[PDB]
């Protein structure tokens, strides 16, 4: 419920 | 579970506005949130996210460098603070929660309209 | 960036008859986290299906969702008068999230 799944870097 | 938004209205093009969306009903800081617009007659558009700590932020490309995402969980509050208001930010700002990595939004707001215009 | 393409833009059905709405995504979705929401004048979205396959809490077995890949299909079996509304699909699985543009799903008559 914690995070967003996401590439490194997104801004 | 519920989440309550307010601070809308009107404010001219380069304004600026801070949304806030009152969470209750569940513990607050244990979920990522996010902001979801949807224009007059259009469809949904997703705006800004934050993880449950408030440790990182995300933004749509529309709206980065302008809009900052916040939250403060002692208040069971996130805000998203509006710089630089262009006649396209005009929409109904939806608050959302998080439900899981988050998998989808399960609880959202009622929503708070808000016209850039001058 | 992942592009939910929703077809039909509008369906026109008679109560009773089946919906099948599409939601084709330009590349790979983990079917976990493609999720489906109605969405009626005036009112927040409402999750409909999650996963795309689980029905949240209080949705009715009339509505179903399946699919994987690139390829997800709601589908409404036999159309209730509260069941015209537009449908949206979701993706949280890769940033940015990205919503379908919808199906309004209108009452023929």
């Known amino acids: 419920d914690a995070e967003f799944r996401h590439d490194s870097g997104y801004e | 579970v519920e989440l309550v938004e307010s601070g809308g209205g009107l404010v001219q093009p380069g304004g600026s506005l801070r949304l806030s969306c009152a969470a209750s009903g569940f513990t607050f800081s244990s979920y990522a949130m996010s902001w979801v617009r949807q224009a007059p007659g259009k469809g949904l558009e997703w705006v800004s996210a934050?993880?449950?700590?408030?440790?990182?932020?995300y933004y749509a490309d529309s709206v980065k460098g302008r809009f900052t995402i916040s939250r403060d969980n002692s208040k069971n509050t996130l805000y998203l603070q509006m710089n630089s208001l262009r006649a396209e930010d005009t929409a109904v700002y939806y608050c959302?929660?998080?439900?899981?990595?988050?998998?989808?939004?399960?609880?959202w707001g009622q929503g708070t309209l808000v016209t850039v215009s001058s | 960036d992942i592009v939910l393409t929703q077809s039909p833009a509008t369906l026109s059905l008679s109560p009773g008859e089946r919906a099948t709405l599409s939601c084709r995504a330009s590349q790979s979705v983990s079917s976990s986290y493609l999720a489906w929401y109605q969405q009626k004048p005036g009112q927040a979205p409402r999750l409909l299906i999650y996963?795309?396959?689980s029905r949240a809490t209080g949705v009715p077995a009339r509505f179903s969702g399946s699919g994987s890949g690139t390829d997800f299909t709601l589908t409404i079996s036999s159309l209730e008068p509260e069941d015209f509304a537009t449908y949206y699909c979701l993706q949280i699985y890769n940033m940015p999230i990205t919503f379908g543009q919808g199906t309004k799903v209108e009452i023929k008559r």
């Open positions: 996963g795309a396959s």
């Open positions: 959302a929660r998080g439900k899981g990595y988050v998998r989808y939004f399960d609880v």
């Open positions: 934050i993880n449950a700590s408030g440790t990182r932020t």
